[PDB]
Amino acid sequence: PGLMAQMATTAAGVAVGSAVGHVMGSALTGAFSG
Amino acid sequence: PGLMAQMATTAAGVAVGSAVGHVMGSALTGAFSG
Amino acid sequence: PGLMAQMATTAAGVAVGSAVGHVMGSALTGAFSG
Amino acid sequence: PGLMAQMATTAAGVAVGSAVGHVMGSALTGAFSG
Amino acid sequence: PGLMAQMATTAAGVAVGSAVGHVMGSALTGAFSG
Amino acid sequence: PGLMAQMATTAAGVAVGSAVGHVMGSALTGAFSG
């Protein structure tokens, strides 16, 4: 395989190119648990 | 295979190119659990 | 295969190019569970 | 005023949660010209 | 004013949570010209 | 004013949480010209 990817992404309180007065973010990730 | 991808994406409180007074975000991810 | 993708996407409280007074978002994802 | 926003947004070739073979996009913006 | 925002946003060839074979994007912005 | 923002944002060939085979992007910005 040219590219194999198993990705677990978590995003909270993300501002991209924005005019935001206040940002709050809480993120939790549990991945690849045996 | 040229590209194999197993992706689990979680987004909360995301502002993109926006004028937001206040942003709140809470995100949780559980992936690839055995 | 040129591109194989198994994607689980969750979005909550997303503002794109918007004028929003207040944004609330809660997202949870469970994927690829054995 | 609580929130005053003058926004000029341009989007071309945008794929959101989609399975697209090929995407082409050309965008131009002229804003707030004196 | 609590929040004053003059925003000029340009997006081309944007893929969000998508399985895309190929993405092409060309974006140009002219803003706040005197 | 609590927050004054004059923003000129340009995005091309942006992939967010996506499985993309190939991404091409060309972006140009001209802002705040006298």
Residue numbers in the entry:
A (entry chain D), B (entry chain E), C (entry chain F), D (entry chain C), E (entry chain B), F (entry chain A): 42 to 75
Please give me the paper's original passages concerning this structure.
Mitochondrial proteins CHCHD10 and CHCHD2 are mutated in rare cases of heritable FTD, ALS and PD and aggregate in tissues affected by these diseases. Here, we demonstrate that the low complexity N-terminal domains of both D10 and D2, as well as the full-length proteins, can form amyloid fibrils in vitro and in vivo. Structures of D10 and D2 fibrils assembled in vitro from the low complexity N-terminal domains of each protein show that their core comprises the most highly conserved region between the two proteins. For D10 and D2, the central conserved VAV motif forms a beta-strand that is associated with the protofilament interface in all the structures we have observed, suggesting that it may be a critical element in fibril formation and may be expected to appear in ex vivo structures as well.
Using cryo-EM, we observed several distinct D10-NT fibril polymorphs (see Methods section on Cryo-EM sample preparation and data collection) and determined three different structures. The first structure we obtained (polymorph-1, 2.31 Å resolution) revealed an ordered core formed by residues P42-G75 and containing two identical protofilaments (PFs) related by pseudo-21 helical screw symmetry. Each PF contains three beta-strands, extending from residues M45 to A53, V55-V57, and V64-A72. Strand-2 forms part of a beta-helix-like turn structure, commonly observed in amyloid fibrils, connecting the first and third strands. The interface between these PFs is formed primarily between the tip of each beta-helix and the N-terminal half of strand 1. Strand-1 adopts a very similar conformation to that observed in the D10-NT PF1 structure, as do the last five residues of strand-3, and the two strands pack together in a nearly identical manner in both structures, with residue F73(D10)/F84(D2) packing against the equivalent Q47(D10)/Q58(D2) residue. Similarly, the location of the equivalent residues in the D10-NT PF1 fold suggests that it could accommodate D2 molecules. In the case of p.G66V, the PF2 or PF3 structures could potentially accommodate the mutation, but it would not be consistent with the PF1 structure and would therefore be expected to eliminate some of the possible WT PF folds.
